[PDB]
């Protein structure tokens, strides 16, 4: 009694969680990015 | 002797089939993105018999979906438009020069 409980949010542990979810997500951009240009190139087949 | 038949030869049925090979393909590449779809295969040498006097065949996936249910494989679909393609200006050739060749002996020219 006489005190009041806080947040047991790690700062840290979110910060250092953001860094890796941004640099995996930038990393699968690209394979988003290198997708369509094997699918551009693969259209040359057809192209008699 | 001396028939149609006997002179044109099977150049006359396989164009037929080279042409429905073609439209099953361009149904897969059309039907791609559609889900649940699933990717339709043609035997030549069953169509090629029956043409020559007178049954679905699915396309096993490499790879699973991804969830659609659609199996069919854009990479595969124009490798075998392009070589249908080829093959079809082969038959063409061939039964093009059936009638030329029977009109030159006709003609002595």
Redesign the interface.
Known sequence: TGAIEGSNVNAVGEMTALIDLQRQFEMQVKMMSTAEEM?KS??S??R? | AISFDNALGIHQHTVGVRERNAEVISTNIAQANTPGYKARGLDFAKELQAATSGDKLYRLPTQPDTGDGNTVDLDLERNLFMQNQIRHQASLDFLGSKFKNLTKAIKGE
């Open positions: 699918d693969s259209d087949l057809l008699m």
